[PDB]
Amino acid sequence: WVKQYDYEDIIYETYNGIAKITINRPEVHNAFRPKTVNEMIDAFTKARDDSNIGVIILTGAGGKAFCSGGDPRLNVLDLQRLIRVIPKPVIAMVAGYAIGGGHVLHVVCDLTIAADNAIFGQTGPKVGSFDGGYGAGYLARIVGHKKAREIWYLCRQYTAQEALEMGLVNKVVPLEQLEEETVKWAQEILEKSPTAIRFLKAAFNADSDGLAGIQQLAGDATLLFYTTEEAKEGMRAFKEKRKPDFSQFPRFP
Amino acid sequence: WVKQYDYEDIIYETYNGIAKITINRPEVHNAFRPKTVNEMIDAFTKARDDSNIGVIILTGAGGKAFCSGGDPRLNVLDLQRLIRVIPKPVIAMVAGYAIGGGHVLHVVCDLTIAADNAIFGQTGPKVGSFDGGYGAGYLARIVGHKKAREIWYLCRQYTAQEALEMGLVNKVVPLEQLEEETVKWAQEILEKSPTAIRFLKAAFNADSDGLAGIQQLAGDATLLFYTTEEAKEGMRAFKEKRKPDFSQFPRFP
Amino acid sequence: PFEWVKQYDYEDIIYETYNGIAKITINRPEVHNAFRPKTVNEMIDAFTKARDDSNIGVIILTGAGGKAFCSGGLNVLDLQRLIRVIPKPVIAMVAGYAIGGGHVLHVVCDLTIAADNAIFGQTGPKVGSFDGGYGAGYLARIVGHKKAREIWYLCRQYTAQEALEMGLVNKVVPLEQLEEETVKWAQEILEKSPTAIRFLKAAFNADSDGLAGIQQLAGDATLLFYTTEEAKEGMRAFKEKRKPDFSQFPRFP
């Protein structure tokens, strides 16, 4: 990993197309405060524009904590949306605690790889808080409504195996092989058509986000369209102060 | 448990913040007729209005039947909606049969704790009936479309263990421990912030019910708003006949 | 046992009927039952034939050999919609490979019965393509977003047992008993109300297809309504050049 920029509350490194973002607050079990969130925003954005990065990993430094949520601007919501809009798969690498806002964060990541020591759960109803956005509805679109309501109403803790069984995480491995497996998964992704991946991610987002999700799927198509010759004719003619000729191009039943 | 009002087909009892509504027709496996549904709507309404009650348990009497379903009018549909709109978590405590209309009832309940003798399944297609509302789509949002379509199309019966494995119920325990476990889960919820829970339940309902769901979520936000200094300024400035002063209060944002 | 009656003449497929059951077999084992425009067109035709045959109440889709259901390839998009609009349950009988477009086909079928040798998976981002329609959102509505995004991003293969465990298929049995089991399930559906079934299937589709799903659900309501005295009066009165009298029919709440 090559430490790429200089952050305070987190760490940003890269390697062979993979970008890893690490919350670094083991003292408070990698909890997040307004500042550390803003840094994650900047970092993801950095990875977003970096055409050499095709996959992103999110993890905690502790070794026994991924994130435990936060310590009065609700900027994590902005990060949740960002993680979903980035046209690149985001893998949450979970070790130890993934609680509260921290659990919602691993939830919105495309995939989650957990160490056998990982602990999952919400805390809101206990400490006077709640995430009724992706934290509720999207979670229910992963584990189903009975389990999602259980998770929020009782605020119990769930081990990796429990998480795996309910479809909350994609895989569980010993703590010592966590990053090894995660990088393995990241590389497999780096071998696929990047455009085919961004389109599917958008399609998955459109599944639950109405027009917001359609803006993403339709947006990507607009991007791809500007690539075609047909599209070129459009702005070419505009510049040439003439009427464009699309008949030159084909249709498709 | 302390019994209060006098219902004929059901029993209403409360205990340290828990309201337990019991369908009392063991001779027909706690199947429901218009009368018993009307009373359940009444009882659920009483539990709704009791500021001491925070969780509601729904169950059947006698050990081998939660509810066998319906014995014109289809008032259970009104009950399903009430169950979902009440700001308090409702737990289906299933012992034995939860069939047909009865199965949909345990389904719309937030959580379900089942005894090892519990039997699950739909019967509509067999007996000339069907529930394509929460009975279909919502069931699919718990067990998945493949499993949900299987349940309705073949109308087979499922064990408690099979129900657990597909995510249909939250927990399974021997018949002798059912109520203790259910009460235990209820008390755990009773230790949480009532407002946190109602907002979470509304958000979950908003995930699948469009505007009807948003009305619940937005409505709670209004109730909450009425508790602020900002809103009261408007109410009083509407009682004092003077242009309200809102710049007085902060922006978050 | 079962003697299928081949009923037409197709090049890439085979259409046979037993007794209430229609079976459509992709017959291009040389390319692991991969489909080309023609085989898709032939499937559209065959499914349409099963749709109009009032003696068919269930449909089976399968691959010719015992090592492939379909291995994949747009007009297949029309097929997907057809399989869903047809008011009869469709059962994918999977032996061997169910990959790429072939995996989506089994996915959209109401139920899936797989042989222990069945293999499932997507190959979109590997072979240059993707299915962001039912291929993504609907799959997510079966196995959850975490798993669905995993299936598409890594394009790995999944055994019959792994597909069962994640709710992707309904049942798994030894290769030699595949049809026997499938037919068994089909005959169970056949003894159910055809009308109750079509309404539930329509309701399931309405769960995720907005106005398109509602068109199907309302459409069946319309069809039913036509066989009522109330409706016939409106018709009769129109033919008799007189104003209708619906007062002779009961209101209901």
XYZ file of N, CA, C and O in Angstrom, chain A residues 32-105:
296
model
N -16.631 7.599 14.589
C -16.429 8.731 13.698
C -17.060 10.003 14.225
O -18.117 9.986 14.859
N -16.373 11.110 13.982
C -16.837 12.422 14.389
C -16.889 13.233 13.105
O -16.223 12.893 12.123
N -17.670 14.319 13.094
C -17.795 15.161 11.903
C -16.548 15.266 11.023
O -16.649 15.201 9.797
N -15.375 15.406 11.633
C -14.144 15.524 10.853
C -13.734 14.261 10.103
O -13.437 14.316 8.912
N -13.697 13.128 10.794
C -13.298 11.883 10.150
C -14.228 11.504 8.988
O -13.814 10.819 8.054
N -15.473 11.965 9.038
C -16.418 11.680 7.965
C -16.005 12.488 6.739
O -15.905 11.959 5.628
N -15.760 13.778 6.947
C -15.354 14.657 5.859
C -14.115 14.141 5.150
O -13.965 14.312 3.941
N -13.231 13.492 5.901
C -12.008 12.954 5.319
C -12.324 11.735 4.461
O -11.722 11.537 3.401
N -13.271 10.920 4.915
C -13.667 9.736 4.159
C -14.303 10.192 2.840
O -14.114 9.565 1.796
N -15.050 11.293 2.894
C -15.685 11.851 1.702
C -14.589 12.161 0.687
O -14.594 11.675 -0.446
N -13.638 12.982 1.121
C -12.524 13.397 0.280
C -11.760 12.205 -0.282
O -11.396 12.192 -1.461
N -11.524 11.206 0.566
C -10.789 10.008 0.168
C -11.521 9.217 -0.906
O -10.939 8.855 -1.931
N -12.800 8.939 -0.669
C -13.599 8.204 -1.639
C -13.639 8.971 -2.940
O -13.561 8.383 -4.018
N -13.770 10.292 -2.836
C -13.813 11.133 -4.022
C -12.503 10.943 -4.770
O -12.496 10.745 -5.990
N -11.397 10.980 -4.028
C -10.078 10.791 -4.621
C -10.056 9.476 -5.382
O -9.649 9.432 -6.542
N -10.504 8.406 -4.731
C -10.535 7.094 -5.367
C -11.513 7.111 -6.536
O -11.314 6.434 -7.551
N -12.575 7.895 -6.392
C -13.580 7.998 -7.442
C -12.986 8.517 -8.754
O -13.180 7.919 -9.817
N -12.261 9.627 -8.675
C -11.668 10.227 -9.866
C -10.399 9.531 -10.354
O -10.016 9.689 -11.511
N -9.749 8.768 -9.477
C -8.526 8.055 -9.845
C -8.838 6.919 -10.819
O -9.211 5.826 -10.402
N -8.668 7.181 -12.112
C -8.948 6.196 -13.153
C -8.144 4.903 -13.047
O -8.406 3.944 -13.779
N -7.163 4.875 -12.147
C -6.338 3.686 -11.965
C -6.928 2.766 -10.897
O -6.529 1.607 -10.777
N -7.874 3.294 -10.124
C -8.542 2.531 -9.070
C -9.871 1.979 -9.596
O -10.691 2.725 -10.138
N -10.080 0.676 -9.435
C -11.309 0.056 -9.905
C -12.125 -0.593 -8.799
O -13.243 -1.058 -9.035
N -11.560 -0.630 -7.593
C -12.217 -1.219 -6.427
C -11.788 -0.452 -5.183
O -10.663 0.041 -5.110
N -12.676 -0.359 -4.198
C -12.351 0.358 -2.971
C -12.648 -0.469 -1.727
O -13.680 -1.141 -1.647
N -11.735 -0.416 -0.760
C -11.890 -1.143 0.491
C -12.040 -0.171 1.648
O -11.322 0.826 1.740
N -12.980 -0.470 2.532
C -13.216 0.356 3.701
C -12.986 -0.535 4.912
O -13.536 -1.634 4.990
N -12.171 -0.075 5.854
C -11.893 -0.877 7.036
C -11.477 -0.036 8.230
O -11.275 1.170 8.113
N -11.369 -0.690 9.381
C -10.960 -0.016 10.599
C -9.550 -0.463 10.933
O -9.151 -1.576 10.573
N -8.799 0.396 11.619
C -7.413 0.098 11.986
C -7.282 -0.800 13.213
O -6.465 -1.720 13.236
N -8.086 -0.522 14.232
C -8.044 -1.297 15.460
C -7.635 -2.762 15.376
O -6.662 -3.181 16.011
N -8.368 -3.542 14.589
C -8.082 -4.960 14.478
C -9.193 -5.660 15.238
O -9.434 -6.856 15.066
N -9.867 -4.885 16.085
C -10.981 -5.360 16.885
C -12.167 -4.411 16.737
O -13.116 -4.456 17.514
N -12.104 -3.556 15.728
C -13.176 -2.607 15.473
C -13.092 -2.098 14.043
O -12.011 -1.808 13.547
N -14.244 -2.012 13.388
C -14.352 -1.525 12.014
C -14.773 -0.065 12.116
O -14.207 0.812 11.468
N -15.766 0.158 12.970
C -16.340 1.460 13.219
C -17.340 1.111 14.322
O -17.826 -0.015 14.397
N -17.624 2.071 15.193
C -18.602 1.855 16.262
C -19.580 3.044 16.067
O -20.237 3.423 17.013
N -19.677 3.629 14.868
C -20.580 4.767 14.676
C -19.964 6.075 15.205
O -18.748 6.182 15.184
N -20.758 7.036 15.700
C -20.220 8.337 16.149
C -20.354 8.933 17.584
O -21.167 8.456 18.382
N -19.534 9.940 17.916
C -19.417 10.597 19.231
C -20.515 11.608 19.572
O -21.263 11.938 18.633
N -22.738 16.665 15.408
C -24.158 17.117 15.291
C -24.502 17.826 13.996
O -25.211 18.832 13.967
N -23.954 17.268 12.937
C -24.200 17.655 11.563
C -24.303 16.186 11.190
O -23.579 15.383 11.759
N -25.235 15.793 10.336
C -25.310 14.358 10.068
C -24.661 14.040 8.746
O -25.278 13.438 7.864
N -23.399 14.440 8.614
C -22.687 14.242 7.365
C -22.370 12.806 6.948
O -21.850 12.581 5.853
N -22.682 11.819 7.778
C -22.393 10.444 7.370
C -23.391 10.059 6.268
O -23.110 9.209 5.417
N -24.547 10.720 6.280
C -25.584 10.479 5.284
C -25.035 10.806 3.896
O -25.326 10.113 2.918
N -24.234 11.867 3.818
C -23.620 12.284 2.563
C -22.639 11.216 2.099
O -22.508 10.955 0.901
N -21.938 10.608 3.053
C -20.964 9.569 2.739
C -21.675 8.309 2.243
O -21.198 7.635 1.330
N -22.815 7.996 2.847
C -23.586 6.823 2.440
C -23.972 6.959 0.969
O -23.797 6.030 0.182
N -24.482 8.131 0.603
C -24.883 8.387 -0.772
C -23.682 8.302 -1.701
O -23.762 7.721 -2.784
N -22.563 8.872 -1.265
C -21.336 8.867 -2.058
C -20.876 7.436 -2.340
O -20.584 7.086 -3.484
N -20.802 6.613 -1.294
C -20.381 5.218 -1.449
C -21.249 4.489 -2.481
O -20.772 3.608 -3.206
N -22.520 4.873 -2.553
C -23.449 4.256 -3.487
C -23.330 4.803 -4.908
O -23.544 4.073 -5.872
N -22.982 6.080 -5.041
C -22.868 6.691 -6.362
C -21.556 6.371 -7.091
O -21.523 6.301 -8.324
N -20.477 6.172 -6.342
C -19.197 5.853 -6.967
C -19.389 4.610 -7.830
O -19.769 3.548 -7.335
N -19.128 4.734 -9.142
C -19.274 3.640 -10.101
C -18.235 2.537 -9.947
O -17.807 1.938 -10.930
N -17.840 2.268 -8.709
C -16.846 1.238 -8.431
C -17.268 0.459 -7.197
O -17.745 1.039 -6.219
N -17.105 -0.869 -7.228
C -17.478 -1.704 -6.084
C -16.721 -1.287 -4.831
O -15.516 -1.036 -4.884
N -17.434 -1.204 -3.713
C -16.827 -0.846 -2.433
C -17.005 -2.030 -1.478
O -18.133 -2.444 -1.192
N -15.888 -2.579 -1.004
C -15.913 -3.721 -0.094
C -15.586 -3.318 1.331
O -14.530 -2.737 1.593
N -16.487 -3.625 2.254
C -16.239 -3.321 3.654
C -15.447 -4.518 4.204
O -15.879 -5.662 4.079
N -14.274 -4.252 4.769
C -13.424 -5.295 5.342
C -13.620 -5.145 6.845
O -13.024 -4.279 7.478
N -14.465 -5.996 7.413
C -14.796 -5.898 8.822
C -14.076 -6.792 9.818
O -14.090 -8.018 9.719
N -13.456 -6.146 10.798
C -12.749 -6.839 11.859
C -13.288 -6.228 13.139
O -13.376 -5.009 13.263
N -13.678 -7.070 14.082
C -14.208 -6.546 15.321
C -15.550 -5.859 15.153
O -16.377 -6.251 14.325
N -15.752 -4.805 15.933
C -16.999 -4.060 15.938
C -17.392 -3.249 14.709
O -16.612 -2.452 14.189
N -18.625 -3.475 14.261
C -19.225 -2.742 13.147
C -20.578 -2.405 13.760
O -21.580 -3.077 13.506
N -20.585 -1.367 14.594
C -21.782 -0.968 15.328
C -22.334 0.423 15.042
O -21.599 1.328 14.652
N -23.638 0.573 15.265
C -24.319 1.840 15.056
C -24.125 2.377 13.657
O -24.337 1.662 12.670
N -23.717 3.640 13.567
C -23.482 4.244 12.273
C -22.435 3.426 11.548
O -22.381 3.409 10.317
N -21.607 2.729 12.321
C -20.564 1.897 11.742
C -21.145 0.681 11.044
O -20.601 0.210 10.045
N -22.248 0.158 11.571
C -22.890 -0.997 10.951
C -23.564 -0.546 9.643
O -23.443 -1.212 8.608
N -24.268 0.583 9.690
C -24.928 1.101 8.493
C -23.896 1.299 7.374
O -24.185 1.047 6.195
N -22.688 1.730 7.745
C -21.627 1.954 6.765
C -21.216 0.687 6.026
O -21.023 0.711 4.810
